[PDB]
């Protein structure tokens, strides 16, 4: 397949070829044009707070070690020994001044430097240039209010700019709330779906909630529960959708601070969020204080998703075209009482973790949609994302980005796939920028 | 067990050994075996309401954890060691039961097939609460659905059971430390 | 069990529960366990003639079905719900036994290896036929052959056993509803 | 590999490259040139007799829904939602007026039409063109005496013409017997063989029976039992072999009406078939009435096989080059007593089903022959099908097709592979016809 | 069993049947079940020193073989039929135990997880050595490590157990003929 | 990838691209340029000593039957029937005058000839040319002191010449000791590593022993035990390394006759080897008699490895780029007492067999190093083998080959990969020779 020419996503992001969820050659191409190029979620300050603390993380199919340096910065390195290529670290988290390879005992510092080689003097003499044998370092590591992302491509936009118009919506909860903590360790489960299936679902799919999650809505008693079995369409102006230049997008459901949490947490959460909102009106204004306590279903392009307020934080780690390793953390507000944080974390896993009853509702949807992309008669068929097209705006006086002023639609699908197609057909960031110079115009046509 | 000598043994595991190696009551092992076999039968036929009614105490904690992989020599990193795949009280189990039985649970059509294998049953009365029964058992759980999906789960269960309504022994605590860190079974949406 | 409340439970499964929850005879459970363990031993060492002679009654029906996947809400489509993977009388079992033992059964060279794991044994006498014993048990069956072929089968078995020649308890009915609709084991050419 | 030029099957179908059973690129090419082009078995009238009845079936690696329409016709559709591509139907059979997708709740009729979309007015307004969003329909669906086949290629020959000379042999049992019923549900088992291995075996392999099935012949006591361990060669004129232009072929074993059935069914069957034959002499003549009660081992190209009289009906559903999903039904004559139909169906599964003792004899043959096609030193090696070559005829006054007048040979292998090679090297039906204009001459050379 | 009639049965297997079909002592089967369940518990928690101390006799032979695949009709080729995956005396088991417990056994970090399922227990006293207990049992052993590595082992075990120090019953022989010829579990570095 | 041009191994064998352990296209290319071209281990005289004795063996991914002929020679044939390609022999060893196919009963002699075809006269008449239908024969089969190797390429150097300078080191143990026996059957285990990972480890890696095998050294009490945990570097001149033109190489550890064997065998072995050495001084000289009782860790290119004295004999049978089937035999000296042979064989399996505690130490090293070769950021990274470079010699007056006069280094890695690169980039043996005309000069640069 010629990725320069092949139309995998139609103009305005209106449709995508079904093969994108199944084609292994395209998966391999994504490793280069998506995962080696873009910002990927690594960890949170709360998981590596002290010097020497480290975790392992995936970046695409590569594994990295993410380490807190003595100076308070964070650096990340390929989890691969520079000698004969053995995996250096076999655990998920810990604290250490360095890492010793179990094959021939080469010792690397927390700063990636080759610090010791067994019997170096007797064996290599002065001939080993350890200075050039440090671990292969992730070129870019940056923080968004404690959330740490990495990028293998030195040419990438800074993380703040990459978030584009999505950052404005995230800030009330990520910044003005006083800050969030990530509660680990994550649940980890493999699903037989393409990474794009859950990514697209979280970025912009409210349409599925009432039908897919009918049983969870009916059984759990959460605040979104009127939707069960498509019994009720949300009121006018119940929310909006947005998308951005570099692919990130989200839905906003006004006031839905208790999110998917069962009735056992609803009154406490609605009290807590409302109280903080009242304080925030004065500092960031009524609209943004309201956004703070509104449910956001977001994907940070390409494969990190979240539900704020519900507190669900996901990484869709790619394995192959029909295999994805799902990591699930809980996010909580730092100033919440500790007992509430504990119960919120448990409730995140109860609903969206490895035995998450909500998350289970989505399984067959993601898996079969992905696997059907391999089937001969479906490869060249068109997946539709046209709901709401022709009603999106850009440059609104109140809400930034390409925005659909309706709770349910496919605005965010279109922006996600516009960015995806621009990357798949480009050789570097400059070419992506050239391919994106009219991004919002394309999305708001008609 | 001396865990300073048996270096690989956790303090928790050493304590649970001690519980069963002492008093052995053969009759109790047989009662425990019956209790667990009947519980597994109810679950296998998806009689989830009957399971709640007959097997699960009102004060239950039903907990399955996943422990983060850490270095055997780790002594400094002290953040949350595990997350809760399940950590359910009775009402939370009831929510999950209603979710299974809901006619719009699309994933339950066509009907799933469950087969449970319970082995290695051990039972001992609590030293202090003469009405509390500790039962340990291992389970293999086979779940088959939709022609060619097959998932097999493996776990050890640390249970406490107590006589409740009508003198019926019911589960008041189940604890499982799930042995596989990354699940390869699509989900853990089964009652171990 | 009320199957109008426990929506996922079949009428057949509810009736089989009822059979075992009533009278419990501990001695009978132990006899049943011995019977099944000895049967499994004979099968594992491929003593198929000995199995017929010692374990299988002349009036046996040995049945394993595969049920077509249908909608949980299906009420109208009423054609054959299952096919018979096995539905054998004694003579038909004998044919299969002779087929296994035939020296021109090329597939049996090199010799297969079987290992059976029988668990969850329950036993109850029939209410009306005081000489009929109902036994339920679950089996994991591991079959290995030719270096790297490994097939693992999982099933619940509903048996009836009755005293025959010499007072020896023998199988007069086995029923298995096989839980996987599409077999991923090359065939089901094993005695569950 | 260049499929226009590569000789995968030698002239006259005398040999085939062993790689054809192992090469995954060729498997992918077959999805286009074999499975998307030819007629494939779907179901029988007896399994979907009433309006609304449906089953799911495979066509190659694609899955379709096959539905009885209100007007009595049958239509088939890809089992894939037109929205985001989720698998629509998760069951194997049922009765319904339509199918609702569990992702976003789109509802399609039994006629494939998009009939309802949740909240269409509020969401899409009048902008959704449901008329163009019907399920992707199988272009061609036709019946041969109740047996329903489908074809994705509108340009295919009608099913009757596609059966070619094979139809003449099938008609006494399929038509003149009063009609057959298919007894479901089928057994379903995965074998680690290429779909062509069992297809070729059923189309034309009598040579293997005495040796491969020695133990089953000795143990079961069926009428073909003299053959056990190659103890006895069938008498002269015990049968014949035939093949046809579009690849279908079969062996005929004269008078073998009880087939593989154990002695417990032999006298009853031989009585039943003989009695019907006596009535048929008057209507269709002695030769054809005899064919009715003669055992036919047939493959309807590419992947549907059967043993008439034995009553075995097979679909070899392709998964990859060394994986095939085997579906096994029983066929019975409609006017048989119901108790005989029941016992015959059980006996079909006893011998050829998932625990079929005969079918098990074939396992290692099919699997190792297929897997050896991946092995480096065997890929370019030649599988032989020359038995009987130079003795076949065409245009015989009594028996139509290319015919080998002997019970055991490889005539039908040659015709099967001649058609296969013509398809693999052709881009469409017109090219196949051009490549087949001297089909019988090629087969009868020397 | 007549192995001239039951053609697939080995002389060794026929002799082991005979051992258990004769005298049945229900109490002995229960003792054997306790012994094996406790042994499996110690192994599952990686209390390998405790296992040696409490379960393994000083005179033990601990043997697991792998038999070469030969023709069922083979009568002439008479070279070594099997190799020893394990053939350990007490000191050799101790070496393996120390290897497991060594803090530079890098493969044991992060800590492995073991779950054992013991079934099909049979027990009989020796005819000639009234202090020797023959125990047969089958094991499924699940080993999980490093996020996504899972290996499952399946075997039948022929044991002899004898009272030693303090009257504690200890293993004096274990024999396993491993059923899979080519291992698909990375290694067989587990105590079956 | 263009294998003529792609530099997979840098000049002097100093580094290799990590992709060589993970790339499936390269694996397929190796089947042609490595496994179909070079000498591969089959069996030993001791395993097929009598006429009619046979074993099956792998050669690359192909399986062969290796048979003792009536005249005392050994011939080997593809284990694939010449009719329809079924696997002929399903057992690992036996004695027979021939092999009958279980599909249609064709009978081949132990000499590969098609000797019988069921009902040949009645079916084929005189038309079957059985003379041209013998099993596909391995072109070359040769012995090195009882160890039997095969090669599919008629153009290969004789096995003695192919061993090159490595033969000199092997001869004291393989020849002058009175001869070795291979004790079967082998252990067989699948590991998730590339075949090159254990091959390179055995050919030239002493550096890893102290660290990788720390626990086994500490626990087992063998004579190499001072090395545990890198506690002690071997004394000066404790050994050497060598490599050769066609890729074979080894390390020599002086006097280490008891090898990896636990203290329970040390005194008996050290007595036995010392006693034979004393006799050998007179016949082959002091240096070579010492080599006899010195531990050699050797790979015979490409995939046969051994530890003499320890008695470990390995075949790393390739399955795919990250799967290898490991066969483990024991080697013993024929004139050892039988009870010592038995205990030595058990000890080989105890340390290096399927439950080999030493072999288990290597698992994660081999598997992760191999699997990391598939990871995107590591494919184009460089595995280092520069230890000792610039200190190797060629043409030494005492020790032949390219030789590093130090116990620990990477000399043998460099020679192994020099030969590998020369084969991967060559179309035949003549081209390999042209690519190798300055082999030792390349290895001894600087
Ligand atoms: N896409 C989602 O999971 C979602 C959940 C809750 C509310 C809105 C969207
Ligand atoms: N190919 C066959 O399965 C066959 C069976 C029976 C008779 C003839 C052929
Ligand atoms: N590479 C090895 O396994 C080795 C073992 C022992 C001594 C030297 C090398
Ligand atoms: S591979 Fe890491 S030190 Fe050698
Ligand atoms: S995928 Fe079917 S309704 Fe959306
Ligand atoms: S495949 Fe071997 S005789 Fe036909
Ligand atoms: Fe959802
Ligand atoms: Fe056959
Ligand atoms: Fe090693």
Residue numbers in the entry:
A (entry chain A), D (entry chain A), F (entry chain A): 1 to 446
B (entry chain B), C (entry chain B), E (entry chain B): 2 to 193
Quote what the paper states about this structure.
Naphthalene 1,2-dioxygenase from Pseudomonas putida strain NCIB 9816-4 (NDO) is one of the most well studied Rieske dioxygenases; it is an α3β3 hexamer and is the first Rieske nonheme iron oxygenase for which the three-dimensional structure was determined. The α subunit of NDO contains a Rieske [2Fe–2S] center that accepts electrons from the ferredoxin component, which originate from an NAD(P)H on a reductase component, and transfers them to a nonheme mononuclear iron at the active site. The catalytic domain of the terminal oxygenase is the well described 2-His/carboxylate center composed of a mononuclear iron coordinated by two histidines and one aspartic acid inside a large hydrophobic active site. NDO has a relaxed substrate specificity and catalyzes the dioxygenation of many two-ring and three-ring aromatic compounds to their respective cis-dihydrodiols.
In order to study inhibition of the activity of NDO by inhibitory compounds, we also complexed NDO with the known inhibitors indole-3-acetate and benzamide and determined the structures of these complexes. The structure of NDO in complex with benzamide was determined to 1.65 Å resolution. Benzamide does bind in one orientation in the active site of NDO. It was hypothesized that this compound should bind tightly with the heteroatoms near the mononuclear iron because the aromatic ring could be positioned between Val209 and Leu307. In addition, the amide group would be able to interact with charged residues on the wall of the active site, while forming hydrogen bonds to the water/hydroxide bound to the mononuclear iron. The N atom of the substrate forms a hydrogen bond to the water/hydroxide that is bound to the mononuclear iron. The O atom of the inhibitor interacts with the side-chain N atom of Asn201, which is 3.6 Å away, and the side-chain N atom of Asn297, which is 4.0 Å away. There are no examples of NDO catalyzing the oxidation of compounds containing an amide group and it is unlikely, based on structural evidence, that NDO would be able to catalyze the oxidation of substrates with amide groups that are free to interact with the mononuclear iron very efficiently.
